């Protein structure tokens, strides 16, 4: 019945201005397996994103991970943009550093 994706953003590491890290964007519990799950920085896609691949869970749904090496900035926004078939809009994730 619930097939949306259960989303989760967050860093590595807790944030601090000018230290490499990691942030993340984790989706779980989605059918179908197909999905768009985007890594924003100040509005636009993240540079260097790598993709896991889908994985099936025993609830007969799907998930993926999303990372991206990154240096938080203070005066930016970051986010997870994510399009799925069960979301009527596509739905973003904020993440406070």
């Known amino acids: 019945a619930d097939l949306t994706p259960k989303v989760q953003v967050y860093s590595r590491f807790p944030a601090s201005a000018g230290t490499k890290n ?24 993240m540079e260097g994103a790598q993709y896991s691949d889908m994985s099936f869970n025993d609830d007969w749904t799907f998930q ?20 799925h078939e069960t979301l009527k809009e596509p739905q973003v994730y904020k993440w406070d550093p």
């Open 22 to 45: 990691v942030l993340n964007c984790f989706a779980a519990g989605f059918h179908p397996p197909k999905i768009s799950i985007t890594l924003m920085k100040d509005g636009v896609p």
């Open 64 to 83: 993926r991970l999303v990372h991206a090496d990154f240096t938080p900035s203070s005066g930016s926004t970051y986010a997870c943009k994510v399009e």
